[PDB]
A paper describes a structure:
Connexins form large-pore channels that function either as dodecameric gap junctions or hexameric hemichannels to allow the regulated movement of small molecules and ions across cell membranes. The hemichannel is composed of 6 connexin subunits arranged around a central funnel. Each subunit consists of 4 transmembrane helices (TM1–4), an N-terminal helix, which lines the funnel entrance, a cytoplasmic loop, two extracellular loops, and a short C-terminal tail. Here, we use cryoelectron microscopy (cryo-EM) to determine the structure of human Cx26 gap junctions under increasing levels of PCO2.
Encouraged by this, we therefore collected two further datasets at higher (90 mmHg) and lower (20 mmHg) PCO2 levels. At the higher levels of PCO2, the N-terminal helices fold into the pore such that there is a narrow constriction where all of the N-terminal helices from the six subunits meet. In the respective maps derived from data collected at 55 and 90 mmHg PCO2, the N termini oscillated between a conformation where the helices met together in the core of the funnel and a position where the N termini were less defined in the density but pulled back from the pore. With the 90 mmHg PCO2 dataset, the top class, including 78% of the particles, gave rise to a map where density for the N terminus could be seen to reach into the center of the pore, consistent with the D6 map. Of the structures reported here, the narrowest constriction is observed for the 90 mmHg PCO2 data where the diameter of the pore is approximately 11 Å, slightly narrower than that of the Cx26 crystal structure but much narrower than the pore seen in Cx46/50. Only slight modifications of the side chains would be required to close the channel completely. Comparing this structure with our structure at 90 mmHg PCO2 shows clear differences in this region. Firstly, the trajectory taken by the N terminus into the pore differs slightly in the two structures, giving the constriction at the bottom a slightly different aperture. In our analysis, we observe that the most constricted pore is seen at the highest level of PCO2, which is in broad agreement with the results in cells.
Residue numbers in the entry:
A (entry chain C), B (entry chain D), C (entry chain E), D (entry chain F), E (entry chain A), F (entry chain B): 4 to 103, 129 to 217
């Protein structure tokens, strides 16, 4: 509800690319995460099935191959890339209150520099942690107390792959948009 | 709550067909998806039953025949066909802010051109992926590790067929309405 | 929340019967569906029990006797009978905006004509599909793959019957109120 | 949210007893039903246990002894006793709109007459249907297909009894308050 | 949402202790009950485990030792201690409306007298019903149909004890604050 | 919704560090707890698995090693560290109402002194209760009625460790920010 009012405040005090394309893509990712993707991961552990009679083997194998869920990583990423925009708004509101270019410049050019770092950091984590963007149907697990190697089966691997590729692609576009914003301000000096 | 306020803003700045019929049908599809259809697909995997003792065969057979759920496809389709309208609103708000036909024409005629493409694209995906709009009671699955061929049974196939035909028919009507909007602007030049 | 504001807008621009009795009964049906009836049908398939060892027989028997749930039919009916009122509101708002009897007459008399058709259509569907308004405790099912004939037992048949009779009776009253509205406008010509 | 605004409108246009005590007790019953009582009846059928191996005996015994749940009866009762107050508000709003004692008297004295009837009707139903206000731990069921007589056990019988006595007592107080309101208007003539 | 607006209205028309400390502690208890304590009691019966093969013994033993849940008692207590404040607000609003010390005194001094009674009554009930504020891991049950004496095990006894002590301590503080409010008005006469 | 309005009121009447960094980190912790961390702990007891046939051993072992859940501790911590800010707001509103440095100084310097105490207290509790910030896959339990020593396995130990380190680190930063706020006011005297 009030989030729409927040967007209008953040909509102002930005450049053409920043006003429209960055904000639309940011809302785009939130909608995908909230209304569509969150129920795909609902039964991630409930429907995780292992071919064994060993008690506790299912708990350790799921924890080994999914140290942190994909949706939790995306939730953290959206929070981190949204804070520098929120910090600017409070700084401007604080600045206006005390009133009744250089300071504005350095705050703005720093905020879009942190967003690029955060986007690239989480994008790198997704790759190393899950060795690619495709989820497998079968995982082989040999952690204690599983005897030898145990076959375990993931829930909805194909649908999770579709949303993973979707979220990564949009994040890559947001990186390019922020990079161009730097170039526009770089040549203007 | 605030979504109603959003509709009023989008209600304005449109033509007779665009103001009323496109917006009503768009709200029509959202209501069907939210209040009625979403709980039909709630137990899609929980009540998926296969006649086998092989561990993991249920996971791979459901994933094979339902790579992405119908409700997730409709959620993606509604988001895509709604973005060009949202892009116009921010462009107009940006245009009005800087103020204090050709630009308006090209943005408007392009937005309704993207909606036709997105509607047809998702409509085509529904056909090829699910080979028609009727869901079967029985699916035969022979993917590893299922031994030979295994019979599996879908949950609520008839009710899902009813809502599938309903959503496809409304999407087809929206395509025709957008096509006529092009014709009205085509003859006017 | 905002739905209350919507009602006030729809409350105006109507006749004495239309202003009060039709709108109150419409809110009456929504309240019954939302706060009371929706949790009666919550375990419709989970608590559906069949006396058999055949895998998949439960899925096909429930689908055979309940092609579409009662609550989904009522949700569709309320949406259909509410659209003509919503179409009038946008037409009036569009008409007022362009400003700054015959047109108003034909739109109004048509809207209450569609409501009668939609109410009677869904009322007819409830009868033919479920052969009466009483739900049985026992259903006998012989669809493949059930061997011979299998006894299956419905969940909460009596409570569902009570709400079915309640919703049908209110719909019948709404039909009569709309018919009288036609008679008042018929004699006035 | 907006319900609080609704109360303020209904708070006005009433007498001293009607303004305060009837409205407070009405909010009192809603709070008990919503925040406290509704989760007591959550597992009414899930935790209903019968001592038998007969398939379907649990479904028919629960349906026999609980034709309609207590919380659904209270939800219906609150809706019925609230409509005459809502009808008056629309009548007054309609009356004021056309402007820009006898009519007001008959509408008001009729509304509080319907509330007494509805309160007594539902109170009578609670008694005959459930033969008293105390819920038993054990119910004996001999309906088909249960063999002979089967023992079944109710979930949370004591807590449900506490809330049943609570709701009945408050309803009895509301009857007395409405009766006195008639007496005050009866002597005044 | 609107509850915050309600607090502002109740915040005014009170004394220094009443304006701040009573209202803060009242909000304090609601937050504990809503956001923290309510999910502790979620599986109170689902995870209640008894060492027996007797059908129905689990139902009767849980009902015997938990006639009413702790969270339901706290929900009732908060509603009761909040009504006298709500009654004053409607009385003042009614008084102001008819306008366009003694009456105000007696209403105010009575309201804080009922709050002390309600706080002490529920505090006494918690003690006698549950014989102290510590919940045990093991309960021994011999009610029919349990054979002899059966061992049953409570879910999350330690966490429930922590929140029980927390709620009792805050209630005790609220009693003292109300008592001092009487003393301040007693000496002033 | 209204929480955003609350933040704006709390945003004012603070110092540079207090206005921005403390409030942003406070919102930061709430977002992590609400949208991300709360569903990690959803199946804490449901997926807790012990290698035994002893009834009731699972209940006592979970209760022994998790006397209070991590998310409940964080919920309590956020409530405690937020009350002194809320107390100041009501004091200022009360002060302004009666109007129509020393008092303001002592209230402000005390509020940030309580926040440091509460942050350190809960941080200490997390350490002693859970002997570090890393959660183990395996816990060995010998409480009655478990025979000898029983192996039990925790659900999602790695993901819970990640969020535990995250919440502790942010709390440590908030302690440092409050300490510096004291130093700024200490030198100014």
């Amino acid at each position: 509800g009030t989030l729409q009012t927040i967007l209008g405040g953040v909509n102002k005090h930005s450049t053409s690319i920043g006003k429209i394309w960055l904000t639309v893509l940011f809302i785009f990712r939130i909608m995908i995460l909230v209304v569509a993707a969150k129920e795909v991961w609902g039964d991630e552990q409930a429907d995780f099935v292992c071919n064994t009679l060993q008690p506790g083997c299912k708990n350790v194998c799921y924890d080994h191959y999914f140290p942190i869920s994909h949706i939790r990583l995306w939730a953290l990423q959206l929070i981190f890339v949204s804070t520098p925009a929120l910090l600017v708004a409070m700084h401007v509101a604080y600045r206006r209150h005390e009133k009744k270019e250089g300071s504005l410049w350095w705050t703005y050019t720093s905020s879009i520099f942190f967003r690029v770092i955060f986007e690239a950091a989480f994008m790198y984590v997704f790759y190393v942690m899950y060795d690619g963007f495709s989820m497998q149907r079968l995982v082989k697990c040999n952690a204690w107390p599983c005897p030898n190697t145990v076959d375990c089966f993931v829930s909805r691997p194909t649908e999770k792959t579709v949303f993973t590729v979707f979220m990564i692609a949009v994040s890559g576009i947001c990186i390019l948009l922020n990079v161009t914003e730097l170039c526009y301000l770089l040549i203007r000096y």
